[PDB]
Amino acid sequence: ITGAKVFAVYGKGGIGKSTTSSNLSAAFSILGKRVLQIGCDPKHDSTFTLTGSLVPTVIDVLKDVDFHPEELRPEDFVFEGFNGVMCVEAGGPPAGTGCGGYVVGQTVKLLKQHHLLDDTDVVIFDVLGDVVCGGFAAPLQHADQAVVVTANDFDSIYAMNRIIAAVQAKSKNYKVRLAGCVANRSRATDEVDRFCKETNFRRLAHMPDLDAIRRSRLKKKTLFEMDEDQDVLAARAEYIRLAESLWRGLDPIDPHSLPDREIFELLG
Amino acid sequence: GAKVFAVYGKGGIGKSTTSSNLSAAFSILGKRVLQIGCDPKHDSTFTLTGSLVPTVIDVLKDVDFHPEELRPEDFVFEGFNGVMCVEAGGPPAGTGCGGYVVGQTVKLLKQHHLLDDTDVVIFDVLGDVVCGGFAAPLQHADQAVVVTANDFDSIYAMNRIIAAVQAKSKNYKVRLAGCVADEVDRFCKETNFRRLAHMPDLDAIRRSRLKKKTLFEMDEDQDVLAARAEYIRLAESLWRGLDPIDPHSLPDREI
Ligand code: SF4
Ligand SMILES: [Cl-]
């Protein structure tokens, strides 16, 4: 992918990864950029808040024409969401067989087959961070920066440590660098900060999704489409700064992943 | 040629706690247990041996991919009540299929014939993704026990695990033995699944003690002995041979 800044939003599930991913796309669109969010999570609900409905996955449409990306139209797997944010979700691989790199590989293949990347200025990959195998690490081959999503619990810090090693493994042969980590919502961050100081990482922003912003409205609309109040405007500003920082570049860092055993003795 | 079960389910919902106590349950029942932790976070056998045992990929890292001079003392460790257990370890971060790690941890066991004496084998497989790589333990498993909870993510993962066992059963011997953990019961009725039991260790017992040692090794109290009976009743129920069932998977839009 060329001619567009690509960011891979990593992080494990259950912490609101799709929330921080879809709002970053909407924040880029507020700043006047053409955004294109690629949903790579098996749970194809990353672009739900952008479109307002379940977008048909690319693998669902490809499994209808017997794997022939010829009769497919751009309006069959790419849908326009809030503020013109183009939404395409790869979906999950077949249950039991098939690889994740195939679902990610075919999505980018049709995006370049129909020339659906010449107009987009920002590409947002929402990638599952629960595993860091080469199949789900495929969006790192196209991304410029990789912002990881993490929470204060142990499983998120363990996944973040696994993504740091995965991105830096791809960093030796690809342009992808680690831009830092982002707390999922405004809570305690002492355990995340201690991991950053030990790994020479860094935490970026801190969105206030915990205070108010009822989960029913979180997963329904995006923050830039909700009605304005104190908490919405405060959370909107946290995503505008994150989008602007990633746009005009950040000062590079050189983190390192702790061994899988040294992270247990760090937290517990 | 022995009974083998695959503990499947999403992470963070105490799946490793379920697979560990299930292994120790078969041990108390007088069975040779072999728990193979396939989770990338190789903490499946933490409560058994009391320590983070070296993984297969970590041994092959300082062994230069050479399974020549490898002995059972390197990767297989003696756990609680004589439970042999080995962590397969996570795939290399960035590149490397999960099926390769599962494929290289079963050949290292068959190379030494460490299965001609065991009776029950427990597979702790990560259920966050139901891709073909992580679905490799389903090929050998006789049945698969799903770990879930009342949240959406655990039910969504269980719904994809059922579809993963269905497709894998068309060419293998894997079956669906049910699930363990209100809203889950509404899922089983629509999918014709089965809700086995429910271990009551969320309250009174401390997750710190849960992640420390197995329930069969803790100090004998009222709450831990009631939890031992739940895992003992589950171990014998699987050994007796539960009445098989054919659950169907739901579309992702319907789930
Ligand atoms: S590369 Fe990853 S997604 Fe693909 S089969 Fe292997 S473990 Fe599964
Ligand atoms: Cl709308």
Author numbering:
A (entry chain B): 28 to 295
B (entry chain A): 30 to 210, 217 to 290
From the paper:
A key step in bacteriochlorophyll biosynthesis is the reduction of protochlorophyllide to chlorophyllide, catalyzed by dark-operative protochlorophyllide oxidoreductase. Like nitrogenase, DPOR is composed of two proteins: a homodimeric L-protein (BchL) and a heterotetrameric NB-protein (BchNB). Given the structural similarity to nitrogenase, ATP binding to BchL is thought to promote its transient association with BchNB followed by a single ET to Pchlide.
R. sphaeroides BchL was crystallized anaerobically in the absence of nucleotides, and a crystal structure was determined to a resolution of 2.6 Å. The asymmetric unit contains four BchL chains: chains A and B form one BchL dimer and chains C and D comprise the other. Interestingly, in chain C, we observe the flexible N-terminus bound across the [4Fe-4S] cluster (dark blue) covering a surface that is normally used to interface with BchNB (purple). For example, in chain C, Asp-23 forms a hydrogen bond with Gln-168 (bond distance of 2.8 Å), whereas the backbone oxygen of Gly-16 (chain C) is within hydrogen-bonding distance of the Cys-126 (chain D) backbone amide (3.5 Å), a [4Fe-4S] cluster-ligating residue. In addition, the side chain of Ser-17 (chain C) is well positioned to interact with the residue directly adjacent to Cys-126, Gly-125 of chain D, through a hydrogen bond with the backbone amide (3.5 Å). The position and specific interactions of the N-terminal residues in our nucleotide-free structure suggest a possible autoinhibitory role by forming a barrier to docking and shielding the [4Fe-4S] cluster of BchL. In the both the ADP-bound structure and our nucleotide-free structure, Asp-182 appears to form a weak hydrogen bond with Lys-39 of the same chain but does not interact with the other subunit.
